Amino acid sequence: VSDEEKVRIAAKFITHAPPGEFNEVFNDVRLLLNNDNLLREGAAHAFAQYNMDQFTPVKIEGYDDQVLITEHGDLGNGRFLDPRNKISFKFDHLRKEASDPQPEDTESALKQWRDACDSALRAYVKDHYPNGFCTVYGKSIDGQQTIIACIESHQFQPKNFWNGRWRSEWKFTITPPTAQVAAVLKIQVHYYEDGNVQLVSHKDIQDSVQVSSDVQTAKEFIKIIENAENEYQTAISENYQTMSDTTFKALRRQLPVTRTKIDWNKILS
Amino acid sequence: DQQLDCALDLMRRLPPQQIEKNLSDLIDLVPSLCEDLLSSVDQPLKIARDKVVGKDYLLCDYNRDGDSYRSPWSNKYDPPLEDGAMPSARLRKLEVEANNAFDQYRDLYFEGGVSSVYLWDLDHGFAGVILIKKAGDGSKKIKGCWDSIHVVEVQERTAHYKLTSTVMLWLQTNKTGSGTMNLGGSLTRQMEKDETVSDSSPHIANIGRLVEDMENKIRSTLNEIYFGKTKDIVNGLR
């Protein structure tokens, strides 16, 4: 196995760290590769990739509420955009710290829509998530005016050997009188007290909404998001119940039909 | 080092859904740990067919030699081998005994699936693995699989038993719900105990009760962790 293949594997592992365990996974891989130069040069991308993939929320000094690190905010040169506070900031992927906030020109013909959606979503997120954060981007892709709503929520409890994270990304492609709606909802949970058990799930959403006033549409968008996310959470709950009451039970009995543990001398006859 | 310790730590964290690819990636990353990783990283059990006896048997590292695997029924390697590692005559007789006993255990608790027991000599006794593999019938669009890997060390009037048991549990469904949902992985537990060895309480009975007690316990714990704990975590995400 070549050094190039070793570092590709190292980068892959790093990018597959479960939520809240990036440092542990990074350290393991670093000690296994045992070549800091190779790691630096061949897995440099892996830190940024992971953070943006995970919608890592970061706190900026002087601004309440946090902002999500996502591909949509990547300003290059190690800086990221906070469309709500109209700022750019430096972000260190390794130390996961923001620094050097600077006013950033955010003006756009999407400006007022991004803002109406953002204020509505922020309220939706405070209500629906215990530890939620959201970042809404307004940009033109392929000339099409698009609102990109990103939601993150996590609960890290390494001391109880578990971490979990929700991520949702909603894309509204505006084409009056109708907006095209695409979304990906994701959940990952990791439990590892004397084991390694993980829930991995995601659902793709495809839909459309009537577009009207800036304010009314925001209401429409958030209503779509709410119905979809509740539906998904409900379906997940339904799967758990079915896995518990049907599949798990059928895999192994609690006790043999005798309703007593096995008499092993008998079995040996 | 320490590389072994990190390797195991990494397998505790990388998604179990890619458990097989994880291991071979890890072997590629650190070629020198190959034997250690192959023996200490548990992997889903594979079913092979013993053409001679017309019975299924389970593949894992413990019945492997080179690229071939030993059937517990015919006691032969497939692909055939000139000098494949075999159990002594004494231990082979016990192994056949254990396979017969755990076959009935399998039927009693799992009402299906496949079982296999492989034994091997130790300095002051012997060890063995008891493997059970059971696939779900796929009802309600849920695919399920249960793997038992019970590894026992016996130090030989009375004997000391050390049991390290891993159960793997995989649940998956692709309802439009819901979208893709995968809930899987494994739990490991360990027990130790001295017990009398006698006519009425031979080694196979002693190991039997140990495996049964352990597995009943783990079944209950899987229920709590999979359907209690991970669900509670989801609900608080929320």
Partner: peptide
């Protein structure tokens, strides 16, 4: 950029590490 900066996996305990080993078997190719 510094890597000793990133701390730190104090490793979990590994129950499978101490199971009886069956030494002296050929590796796969």
């Amino acid at each position: 950029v510094n890597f000793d900066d990133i701390a730190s996996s104090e490793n979990l305990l590994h129950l499978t590490a101490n199971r009886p080993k069956m030494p002296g078997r050929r590796l796969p190719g």
